[PDB]
Amino acid sequence: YIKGIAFDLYGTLFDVHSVVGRCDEAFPGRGREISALWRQKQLEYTWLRSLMNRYVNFQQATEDALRFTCRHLGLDLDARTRSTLCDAYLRLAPFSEVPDSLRELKRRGLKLAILSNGSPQSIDAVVSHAGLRDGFDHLLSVDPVQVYKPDNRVYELAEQALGLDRSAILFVASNAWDATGARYFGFPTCWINRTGNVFEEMGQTPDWEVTSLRAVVELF
Amino acid sequence: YIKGIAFDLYGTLFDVHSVVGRCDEAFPGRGREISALWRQKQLEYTWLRSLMNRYVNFQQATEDALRFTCRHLGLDLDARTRSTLCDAYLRLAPFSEVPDSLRELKRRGLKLAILSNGSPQSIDAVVSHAGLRDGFDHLLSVDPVQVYKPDNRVYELAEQALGLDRSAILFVASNAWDATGARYFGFPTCWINRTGNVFEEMGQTPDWEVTSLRAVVELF
């Protein structure tokens, strides 16, 4: 039934925990605090700007979210440190099972795509850096539609880019709010729950809840 | 210039801190923790459901958000406690300056309106309970437009209900993300910052930043 798979990038295939460390190096002892807030503001800003119809790209939203975090915590953030922390996203490392799992999925003749927030160039840098670039048929950004998830215009992009009806595309995401959007859209959804989180209470439940990509491979 | 004022309810005119206590009584020692998460999920659910075009009223969103908080914390939440905590919002107390400030503003011939998320009946209960019901020309809910702020359809409601152009309506809100939306819409905006928060980094700045309603009265 499923002929393609759409993956979220940050937090699903690639571990963002490394940013915590780069944050702690910039502001010793503050790392975890800074990252938690930074991540949250990035999210809120994508949702809020979408609702207001005031789109700016993810790099912009990321800087704005860091600028806020720093003002909010009282930290002095110069331009240099700003760029350096923001660059931490281009050097993420994949989760242990990811590489082998991707190889196996491709060997099964499945079309694999990534649908993320960053530019196609940034998405490319992360996957290429990990040597996984050859494993994807498509590297998609929300940028062309000028809106963020869970706006349906974003999900239609994956459907179009992959050339398959939504019912034949497996949507794989770590974020429960994202899995909720995809489910309402029509994608058979797989929620990757590695750390014991509970699903969002927005009227949906994923088709599959797995602890890693290993369980995805075993679905085929 | 300004002939009317649109006020947000929870957190602007009425103190929600009382919910913390009712939460701690239900789950001793957990109060602050439960409330912080509950408040955050209410917000996220209003934004997310709007983006997905999956509207449910605020009472619903509030229950869903509490149900999630409880599952997330491991707390056992029965129906009774659910209703009781949810009812805590109908018995809020206004901030000290609020009553006198409202009296003074009305004495100046200004049209006063409240634009909140809850039903007109719930909004009425809170204001009536505090004996402030006679102080408002309009008690507005987002319900008629089936979407939440910062969606512009919500702001147009206030403009229509008050019978004034947006340029003549002062938008007063405690939430910086809300003040940002109103500003992009066209309302001269007053941000009530009582506890030293910093403004959101979404490209806007309020026209006035005050520490309480006392400074609002002094504007006229």
Query: Considering Cα of A98, then A200, then A89, then A19, what sign does the dihedral take?
Result: negative
Three-state DSSP at A82 gives helix
Tokens at B151, concatenated: 């969606």
Contacts 24+ apart (CB under 8 A), A32-35: A33/A73, A34/A69, A34/A70, A34/A73, A34/A75
Q: Indicate the resolution in Å.
A: 1.8
Chain B residues whose CB is inside 8 A of the A47 CB are 44, 47-48, 51
How many whole angstroms separate alpha carbon A11 and alpha carbon A17? 9
Q: What is the DSSP string of B153-181?
A: HHHHHHHHHHTS-GGGEEEEES-HHHHHH
List the catalytic residue out of A8, A15, A134, A178: A8
Looking at this protein, which amino acid is placed at residue A198? Answer: V
Task: Determine the residue among B38, B46, B48, B76 to mutate to test chain A binding: the one whose Cβ has the most chain A Cβ atoms within 10 Å.
Answer: B48
Q: How far does B57 lie from chain A, in Å, by closest CA?
A: 12
Q: How many residue contacts between A and B have a Cβ separation below 8 Å?
A: 88
Q: How far does A200 lie from chain B, in Å, by closest CA?
A: 7
**Experimental method reported for this structure:** X-ray
Contact A112, A102 (CB under 8 A): yes
Chain B residues whose CB is inside 8 A of the A53 CB are 152
Chain A residues within 8 angstroms (CB to CB) of chain B: 41, 44-45, 47-54, 56, 64-65, 67-68, 71-72, 149-152, 177, 180-181, 184, 197-198, 200-203
Domains of chain B plus CATH, in order, are 1-15+91-220 (3.40.50.1000), 16-90 (1.10.150.240)
* Residue A68 backbone phi and psi in degrees, to 5: -65, -50
How many whole angstroms separate alpha carbon B215 and alpha carbon A155? 46
Query: Are B52 and A198 an interchain contact pair (Cβ–Cβ within 8 Å)?
Result: no
Tell me whether residue B197 is annotated as binding. no
Nearest Cα to A7, choosing from A195, A197, A161, A201? A161
